[PDB]
Amino acid sequence: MREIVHIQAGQCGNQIGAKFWEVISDEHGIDPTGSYHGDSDLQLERINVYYNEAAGNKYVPRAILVDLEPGTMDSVRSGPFGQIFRPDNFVFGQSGAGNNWAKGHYTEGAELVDSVLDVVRKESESCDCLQGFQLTHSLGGGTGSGMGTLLISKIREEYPDRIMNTFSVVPSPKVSDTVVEPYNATLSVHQLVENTDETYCIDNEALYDICFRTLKLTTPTYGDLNHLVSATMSGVTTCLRFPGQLNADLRKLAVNMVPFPRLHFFMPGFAPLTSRGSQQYRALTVPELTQQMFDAKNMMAACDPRHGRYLTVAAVFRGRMSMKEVDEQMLNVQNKNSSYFVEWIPNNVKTAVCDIPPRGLKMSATFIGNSTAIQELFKRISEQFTAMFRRKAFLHWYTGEGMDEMEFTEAESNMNDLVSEYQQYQDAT
C-alpha cells in the first residue's frame, strides 16, 4: 500500500530519472526488460510502491515522462531502460518550450496538461492507497520551469492531504549556462513557495565540487554528475521500501522537519564517498559517516553552514548497525557546533535507521538538512533578477505572451518574502 506516482519534466530532470529508475531497478532486482530476477524476498513484499505489477510476470515503472520535443523521449527509449517503461506513458509535445517560462506555463502549457492529468488520474485510481507525488525537473530551462509548476497548482486543487516534493535544481551561482536563469528562477519561485510541501534544492556548482573534491575525478559525465542525486532520492524513501529498526516514510520526514509551511526548502547529504582505489585506507564506520555529513563541502547545495543557522536535522541510515555507536555520535556533534544551531529546539537531530544497505558497501547514510544558509544565495538571485530588470530587458517575450510588471514584481516581492522569513528566524535565537 501507500503507492507513489512519479512525474518528470524538463530535460535535465528526465536524464536524472533515466538514471534514478536504474537505481530503483537494482534496488528491487528489476531487469532491463520488466521481469523479476531478485533473490531477497524483502523486495517483493513492498514492490508495489514504485511499480505496477502488470499481467503475466510483468513490472512497469509507475512514472509519467513529460517533454515538449521528441528528442529526449527518443534518447530514453533507444538507450538503457527505455523498453522497461510503458509506451502509453511517453506523453510528450512537439514544440519545445523555447527556454521560456511563459511558453511552458501559459501558451504551450495548456495543451499537454490535459493528457497528463488523465494519466495522473489513471494511476491514482489504480493505486490502492496513495502516498504522494514526486517531480524531477529543472529551474533553468523552459520545460522544467513552466510545465512542472503548472501541474502542481492543479494537484493542490485536487488533493489536500497528499504530500509533494520537487527535486528541483537551483539555478547556478557563478557559471551561467542559461542566459535567462533569473527569469526561469523567479517565476518558478512563486509556484514553489505556495503549494509545495517540501522542496529539494541542489546547486549545480557543488555537484561539480563533490564529484571533484572527494572523488578526485578527471572527466565527470552526467552519468556520474546526476548519479549522486539518484542515490540521494533513493535514500529518502529507503525506510519505506524495507523494514528497519526505526522505520520512516515521506510523511514522517515532513512533519518532523518543516516548522512552518513557508520554510520547507531543504538540502541533501550523502555518505560514504571514496576514490576507485582510495577506498580501503579509511575506517568506513559510523563516526566516519558521522563527520562526513556535517562539513560544508558535503552539501550538494553550495552553502556554508558557518554563514547561517540550522533549524532541523534529519538523518536516514542504511544497512545493519548498532545504536549507541550512532546515538552518541548523533548527540555530541550538536555540542561541538553548538552556536551554529538555534536555541528554541531541543535535540533537533532526527534519526532514521533502515536495515537494508545499498547494493554495494556495508553501511550508508543520507543526510537531510535545513538551514538559513540558502537565503543568501537568493540575494544573489534577486540581484541577478534586478540586474536584468533595472533596465527592463527581456520583457517583450513575456509581453508577447502577456504579463504585467506586477507579476514580475510581486514574485520578486514574494522572493523577498522568503528573504524576510529565513532571516527572521535566523535573527531570532
Partner: protein
Amino acid sequence: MRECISIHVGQAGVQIGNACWELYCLEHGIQPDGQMPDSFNTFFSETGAGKHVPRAVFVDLEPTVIDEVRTGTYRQLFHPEQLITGKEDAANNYARGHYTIGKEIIDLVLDRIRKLADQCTGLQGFLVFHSFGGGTGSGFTSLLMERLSVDYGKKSKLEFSIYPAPQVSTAVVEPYNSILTTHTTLEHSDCAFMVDNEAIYDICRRNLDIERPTYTNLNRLISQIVSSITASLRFDGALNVDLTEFQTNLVPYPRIHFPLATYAPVISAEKAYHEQLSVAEITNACFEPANQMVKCDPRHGKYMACCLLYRGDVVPKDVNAAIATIKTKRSIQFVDWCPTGFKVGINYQPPTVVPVQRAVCMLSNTTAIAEAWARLDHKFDLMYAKRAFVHWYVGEGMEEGEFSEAREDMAALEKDYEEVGVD
C-alpha cells in the same frame, strides 16, 4: 481461572511484545506453534485441539512491523483476527493518532477485547505496551483508554510504557506528545510505568559488557520485568502478591501512580562467577542509582512506597535481615510519615534465560521521578514559545488552548509530589 490480557500500541510496543511472548513461550514450554510436548490462564487460552494462543492484540496504523510478525519466526502463534493493521500512519503526529486515522479502526480493536473477555472470568489487569515517542503509540493510546473505563471501570489497567529520553532524543515533536497525553493517562490508568532508554545503555555498556547495544537487547531487559510482576499469578510462591494488591499498596493517593521498575542482579556471562548473589547482596544493588532503568537519582527525593518481587531461591528471614539494613541507613531515606514502606513477594521459580539462581524486581513509587517531568517541561516551553509546529495539530483538528489546558495540568501534577515531599 484468572486472566490478564495484553494490548500492544504503536511500533515500539510491538518489538517489546516480540521479545515478551518469546519469553512466555520459553516459560511454559510453548513452541512458536502454540504447542507444548497447569494454571497459565493469565496469558494463554486453550483451543479445542492441543494448541494455545496468546491473549495479545497488535494494533498499528502502518502495515510494516506487523508483517514482521505475519512473516517472522513467530508467525503461527497468533490468531489472524488479532493481527490488526492500518494503512496510513500517524507518522509522529499525535493529532493524527487521536483524530484523523485512529478514529476509523477503533471499532475493530475494541471488538476484539470482548471476544477475548468471553473466556476470561478472573479479569485482573490490562497490559498496554505503548511508547510516548511515536504518534501511533501515543495517539491511539488516548483513544483506546477512554472506552475501557466506560467498558469496565472497576477492572485494572496497567501501562508498561517507555519514557522519552532527556538527552538521546530521536524525533522532534516528542515534547508535544507528553503534555497532550497527560489528561488521558492520569484519568484512566490505574498505575502507569515509566522506563527511559537512556539508563539502559550504561547497564548494557558496563554491567553487560557490550558497549554498543541493539534494540533487540533493549527489549530483553524490560521483558524480564514484566514476567516477574506476573510471577505470583503464573506460579506459586510462599508469598504470592496478586495484581489487585499492587495498585492498593503502591498508591497512597489515587493520582500518584508512577513507580519505576528495577531489575537486579544484572550481570554478564563472564561475571557470573566472582560473586555469590545473596539476598542481602543484591538488594543494595537495587537502590544503586546506576542500576535502575530511569534517569532519576533516588537520592534527590524521598521514597513514598517500595516493592520487592523476589524469585529463584529465597528465604524470608534472610530477606528480613536485608530489609532491616536499608531502613537503618541514612543516604537511603523514606517519606517519614510512611514508616511501613515495603511490599515483599517471593516465588519459588528461577528466572529463566533467553538466548542464574535468583532475581529481584524493585518497584519504588518515589519522589525522585518528579524531576524528570520538569526536565521535559523545559523542553516543551521553548518549542511552544515560538508557536512552532502548531499548524500540524491545528492542521489535523486540534485546539490551540488544548495545549494550554494541558499546560497547567502538568503544574497540578508537579505540585503533588512537592506537597507530599514535605511533612
